[PDB]
Design a protein around this ligand. Structure first.
Ligand code: NAG
Length: 379
């Protein structure tokens, strides 16, 4: 059964991150660490939703801080660099924030009710950048990660757009940009991404077409990186689809841009340029205007690896001990835990009293809940 490490009293789980194999659980007014089977606590200010623990011991923890976003170190001391804006939201709402090589990227508004953008903050990868108006959905993102596209680091983000007039439709995308992007070709555009492209994802089966992304992660294989994307639906089902990043990178490399029929500029939109090389005026104008590939990415096997119940909140993966390239996939709903074996294709489930926020695998599955940190599978 699950070994529960309980909070003194049930908490509002606001965020969960793994850093160097240590689990950081942000709540309202505190952050908890879990490792070596011990749950420890750093209390912080109250009315302070801890949305953010990132690497920049020296772990930066940030929260709404009663409506004035603020960051601390894990020991509760104030952050010497006075980070706040862009590191925690202005209220308890969903955020996407990541750091890679100490570079921080975030969709967190940097002013209250500001325009929703995906930003890189000033740092080791270059000065601050932001997406153009409406490039990112009002809803923000559902996933973000850094991955090499051959030679260069690119940032990939997932999100579901909402469009249409007579009919409101949802559209899932993955978008790519260069981690070290130097921005636009003129002073006015110099802090805008210059390499942003997006491509539609597909996750269909038997007429069911999944659109709302819940959560995602990647898995490295011998020759590829596999992107796992869990979708929800307003119906009674959810769905997990997988994608080849090689396939996705090829599409960004070779697809034409929707609505643009002239030969693409050179160098091409969306590729990374050596430090000191700036995007050309023509490429930037085209990419700003035509940021969507004329393509749609099909999942591996052309359908979901599996369908589950709607309302799945999170999932994670653990590669099977002796069956390599096989996995156990854990996923959760508010009050239930599920696992899918990729080899057998059997799904198991159990109901729990705990209100589950996420599942994160270290050497075992950790289930983070209102009641605390649960170690190991139940049933
Ligand atoms: C948690 O507390 C124990 C002492 O009870 C300590 O050994 C351990 O270092 C602490 N863990 C973290 C990550 O602070």
């Amino acid at each position: 059964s699950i070994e529960w490490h309980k909070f003194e009293t049930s908490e509002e789980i606001i965020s969960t991150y793994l850093l160097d194999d240590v689990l950081y659980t942000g709540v309202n007014g505190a952050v908890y660490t879990f490792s070596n089977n011990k749950l420890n606590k750093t209390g912080l200010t109250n009315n302070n939703y801890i949305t953010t623990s990132i690497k920049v011991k020296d772990t930066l923890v940030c929260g709404t801080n009663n409506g004035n976003p603020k960051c601390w170190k894990i020991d509760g001391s104030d952050d010497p660099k006075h980070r706040g804006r862009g590191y925690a939201p202005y209220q308890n709402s969903k955020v996407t924030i990541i750091s890679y090589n100490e570079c921080v990227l975030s969709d967190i508004n940097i002013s209250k009710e500001g325009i929703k953008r995906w930003r890189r903050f000033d740092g080791p990868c270059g000065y601050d950048l932001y997406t153009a108006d409406n490039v990112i959905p009002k809803d923000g993102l559902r996933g973000a990660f850094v991955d090499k596209d051959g030679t260069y680091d690119k940032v990939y983000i997932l999100f579901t757009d909402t469009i249409g007039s007579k009919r409101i439709v949802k559209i899932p995308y993955i978008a790519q940009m260069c981690l070290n992007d130097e921005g636009g070709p003129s002073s006015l555009s110099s802090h805008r991404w210059s390499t942003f492209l997006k491509v539609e994802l597909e996750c269909d089966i038997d007429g069911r077409s999944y659109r709302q992304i819940i959560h995602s992660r990647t898995i490295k294989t011998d020759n590829d990186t596999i992107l796992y994307v869990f979708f929800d639906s307003p119906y009674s089902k959810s769905a997990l689809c997988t994608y080849s990043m090689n396939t996705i990178k090829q599409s960004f490399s070779t697809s034409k841009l929707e609505g643009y029929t002239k030969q693409l500029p050179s160098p091409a939109p969306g590729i990374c340029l050596p430090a000191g090389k700036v995007v050309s005026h023509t490429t930037f104008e085209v990419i700003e205007k035509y940021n969507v590939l004329d393509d749609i990415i099909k999942p591996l096997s052309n359908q979901p690896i599996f369908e589950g119940p709607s309302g799945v909140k999170w999932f994670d993966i653990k590669e099977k001990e002796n069956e390599h390239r096989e996995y156990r996939i854990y996923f959760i709903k508010e009050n239930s835990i599920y696992s899918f074996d990729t080899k057998s294709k059997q799904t198991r489930s159990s109901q729990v009293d705990a209100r589950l926020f996420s599942v994160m695998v270290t050497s075992k599955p950790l289930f983070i809940a209102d009641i605390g940190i649960g170690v190991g599978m139940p049933q």
